[PDB]
Amino acid sequence: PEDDSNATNSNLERVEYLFLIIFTVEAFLKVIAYGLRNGWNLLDFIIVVVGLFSAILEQATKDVKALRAFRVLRPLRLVSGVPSLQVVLNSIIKAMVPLLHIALLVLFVIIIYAIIGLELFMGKMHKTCYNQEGIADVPAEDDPSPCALETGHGRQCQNGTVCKPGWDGPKHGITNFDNFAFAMLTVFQCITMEGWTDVLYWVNDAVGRDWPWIYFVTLIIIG
């Protein structure tokens, strides 16, 4: 964290220069002897170019270290390096093109349910019990849950608490139906059957316990 390092991370950067110089002479010897059409060779060239650019930029400044993520695509050269695994990779990848007629259905279901959640639960999960001294800090454990006003049909606040707006959200504002970006991701998370009951119960505490199940159970069954 925060620009720290040690001796090992200092020597590894030096070794990266040797690795890059080796790959660059490989690129030279294959580019002045063939003149790229294959995907694997093009990927190798892309990795070499990005490595050269990153090394030069880091020597210049001395987001700097943010394009080093292209180094993780170098293990992908082991698949290309042996012809006995390219066949397996192709047999795995070519089994996927029949599944593109299910990916489209999943996408349409996600979009439709995101729009329905936008029209049903938009902005309803932004209030919680706040004690009665003002808005101090969400006085309900480390897990505050949405409530509803006295005129609402959601969860009512406890004895010494009052429902008051101005709250980030159930998961720091990440899980909600505010836009087509939050909703389209909450719907996907529910579709993967992970943490869908949490969203269902947050909605239950928000609007009520009568008709969010018709949404969530149908989404689970269909998608």
Binding site: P1, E2, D4, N6
Partner: protein, 424 residues
């Protein structure tokens, strides 16, 4: 003299059920230990209800009574009650007499019930610390490199703010920090007197440090050894110690230690703070070569205990002195925990001298059993200096060898302020 003798004759026994311990717990309204119900007659001098028949015991809330350590301490500290009453009978004006034990429990006479959450600990009191060791020259080193960012930084900030609370006006302290370049955290640049005002500056400056950069132990320790070799400013000319607040690393800095203290005249105490997976090997090595100790602080709850155990190491030369180290010391004017006003307290350490007549123990006999304590209220001193014979403009006053007034007409039973109060 009646606590060293009784402790030596004590036999360490591990079964307390068949043979219960009878005592009065101060903070109360259990097999293995019986409790007493006192009469608690109201009496003068003190401003509460007291019982002159037995001594009360205070045990910290995080110290479990019923342990083999606490219960063993409650027997040999029962012949103290007979010496507590003899002192009171000879001098009827005697105020609180107390034995602060190294275990954590304080036995005081006369018995009186203890005063929200009780955070009292006898091992952190100013009168206990001043008798447990000689004045020091603490210099705190704080690792503010990148790896300490996050939870382990707020644990370091709290830990430094808690060891500054163990320093009196006779000790000298400064706080530094290294993040591949060692610097001070405050406007001081050298050791300061560590009084109420100076410690507030260090506490405020420590709370404002940010973690970013490369760890470098050689530059940090060179700065620390340079600041302990000033001799241009007022100092204590006593225990020269260094606290290193880091998490872990791979650097031993053996070149620096061979350059600055080859004779090992400066102790090094090393602390490993937070939960991490960094190497704690070099951190423990600096604490063994240099005549110090190694402590670990993994959470907030371990801050209080681990920041006050460095006085057991500092008391080792004091025990080996023998009878030459048994001098009564009087603390500054402070407010009594059991509310009585402004008081000063006498102090005398107690040594573990089991096997002394055999001359071969030297194992736990290098540590102290605890610190004695007798309180003298400022009203008692004011009665020895009659005033009504002089004019209304005439008065007495007395001062410490520090400038602090022991008695003065303008000395009020209120704490001194060190800035503008604020609320968040």
């Amino acid at each position: 003299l009646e606590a060293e003798k009784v402790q030596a004759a004590h036999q360490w026994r591990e079964d307390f059920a068949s043979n219960e311990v009878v005592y009065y717990n101060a903070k109360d309204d259990e097999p293995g230990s019986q409790r007493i119900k006192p009469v608690f007659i109201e009496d003068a001098n003190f401003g509460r209800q007291i019982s002159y028949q037995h001594a009360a015991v205070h045990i910290p809330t995080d110290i479990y009574e019923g342990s083999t350590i606490v219960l063993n301490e409650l027997n040999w500290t029962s012949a103290l009650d007979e010496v507590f009453k003899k002192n009171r009978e000879e001098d009827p004006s005697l105020l609180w007499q107390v034995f602060g034990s190294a275990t954590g429990l304080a036995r005081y006479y006369p018995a009186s019930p203890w005063v929200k959450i009780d955070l009292y600990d006898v091992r952190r009191r100013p009168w206990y610390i001043q008798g447990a060791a000689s004045p020091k020259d603490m210099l705190i080193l704080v690792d503010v490199s990148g790896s300490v960012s996050g939870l382990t930084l707020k644990l370091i900030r709290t830990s430094v703010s808690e060891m500054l609370e163990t320093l009196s006006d006779d000790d000298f302290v400064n706080v530094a920090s290294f993040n591949s370049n060692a610097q001070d955290v405050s406007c001081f640049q050298h050791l300061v007197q560590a009084n109420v005002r100076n410690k507030k500056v260090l506490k405020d400056a420590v709370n404002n440090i940010t973690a970013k950069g490369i760890t470098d132990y050689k530059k940090g320790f060179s700065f620390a050894f340079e600041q302990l070799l000033n001799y241009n400013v007022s100092r204590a000319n006593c225990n020269k110690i260094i606290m290193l607040f880091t998490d872990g690393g791979e650097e031993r800095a053996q070149e620096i230690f061979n350059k600055y203290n080859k004779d090992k005249k400066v102790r090094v105490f090393t602390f490993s703070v937070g939960q991490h997976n960094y190497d704690r090997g070099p951190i423990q090595w600096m604490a063994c070569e240099n005549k110090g100790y190694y402590y670990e602080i993994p959470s907030i709850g371990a801050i209080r205990i681990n920041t006050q155990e460095y006085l057991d190491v500092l008391g080792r030369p004091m025990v080996l002195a023998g009878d030459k180290a048994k001098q009564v010391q009087w603390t500054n004017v402070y407010l009594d925990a059991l509310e009585l006003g402004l008081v000063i307290t006498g102090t005398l350490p107690v040594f573990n001298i089991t096997g002394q007549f055999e001359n071969k123990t030297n194992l736990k006999n290098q540590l102290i059993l605890g610190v004695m304590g007798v309180d003298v209220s400022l009203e008692d001193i004011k009665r020895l200096t009659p005033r009504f014979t002089l004019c209304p403009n005439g008065y007495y006053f007395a001062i410490d060898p520090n400038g602090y007034v022991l008695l003065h007409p303008n000395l009020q039973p209120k704490p001194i302020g060190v800035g503008i109060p604020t609320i968040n």
